[PDB]
Design a protein around this ligand. Structure first.
Ligand SMILES: [K+]
Ligand SMILES: [K+]
Ligand SMILES: [K+]
Ligand SMILES: [K+]
Length: 303
């Protein structure tokens, strides 16, 4: 419907140490994608078969626990959405009595409560990530090799990842966000200019409100776009670099964690970009509609 945010999946939050980024989209942590990748690596190594058990019982548990945790925050999610829907939509704002300043304050408070819930309910889950990571490191010690560990699985995965990465329309996301930022800045500059001449506080405030959310969503989009590009570029550099047939076991652990990290961040970023792209287009529609309404009331050309 008109000028209404229907989905607020774009909010995210990281822990205080900034090691972990929590997304509202499954699997919620990029690390779960890394655990899913290591399932693949593990299948090439007879010695580390126990990972099949760890994945089934610990990784899938953690994913469900994350989903459960996120689900607990649904009432807080709805509360923020209700406030957004009032603030972005003058007609809706006009059906209640509080001042715009008061509703803004409420929104700020509930938004932080909601984001805080996404983190607080996932704290034990974050601890489980570190434990599984360490379990994987310990497990790789079981590899028969010591000084001469084969790198074929590593390089096989890199070849598969290069093909997978080509499926991402990177250039399109880049072109989109550049055009979008240009339009966004123009809209902010427009409001700075016309608000001097136009007396329509609720509509101007609604536009500013939506523009502040757009700035946040753009920031989130650029964060993931950069992460995706880094993964593509770095894994490409590995495929173009030296190709040792054999390395130490500790080195092979680092190899697997390195490409598993790049691949999981890539997948997590792909998920988020798709969602954020939709989010941005829909916010921009609201700004278009409200700017159109602002100008529609003018009886003469504004200079
Ligand atoms: K559960
Ligand atoms: K008023
Ligand atoms: K474990
Ligand atoms: K390669």
């Amino acid at each position: 419907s008109t000028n209404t945010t229907d989905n607020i999946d774009y909010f995210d939050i990281s822990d205080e140490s900034n090691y972990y980024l929590i997304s509202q989209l499954r699997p919620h942590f990029s690390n779960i994608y890394f655990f899913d990748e290591f399932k693949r690596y593990a299948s090439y190594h007879t010695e580390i078969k126990r990972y099949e058990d760890i994945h089934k019982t610990k990784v899938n548990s953690l994913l469900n626990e994350a989903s459960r945790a996120i689900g607990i925050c649904n009432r807080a999610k709805n509360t923020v959405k209700g406030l957004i829907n009032i603030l972005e939509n003058p007609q809706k704002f006009k059906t209640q009595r509080e001042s715009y300043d008061v509703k803004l304050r409420q929104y700020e408070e509930k938004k932080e409560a909601f984001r805080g819930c996404l983190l607080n309910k996932n704290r034990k889950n974050l601890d489980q990530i570190k434990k599984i990571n360490n379990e994987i490191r310990d497990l790789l010690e079981k590899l028969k090799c010591s000084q001469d560990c084969q790198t074929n699985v590593y390089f096989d995965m890199i070849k598969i990842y290069l093909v997978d990465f080509k499926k991402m329309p990177y250039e399109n996301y880049d072109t989109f966000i550049k055009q979008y930022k240009n339009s966004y800045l123009s809209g902010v500059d427009m409001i700075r200019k016309i608000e001097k001449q136009i007396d329509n506080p609720v509509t101007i405030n609604a536009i500013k409100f939506t523009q502040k959310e757009m700035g946040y969503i753009i920031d989130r989009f650029e964060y993931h776009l950069q992460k995706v590009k880094h993964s593509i570029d770095q894994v490409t550099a590995l495929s173009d670099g030296v190709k040792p047939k054999q390395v130490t076991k500790n080195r092979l652990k680092e190899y697997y964690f390195n490409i598993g990290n790049y691949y999981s961040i890539f997948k997590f970023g792909k998920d988020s970009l798709n969602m954020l792209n939709k989010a941005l287009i829909h916010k921009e529609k609201i700004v278009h509609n409200l700017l159109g309404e602002l100008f529609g009331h003018l009886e003469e050309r504004i200079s």
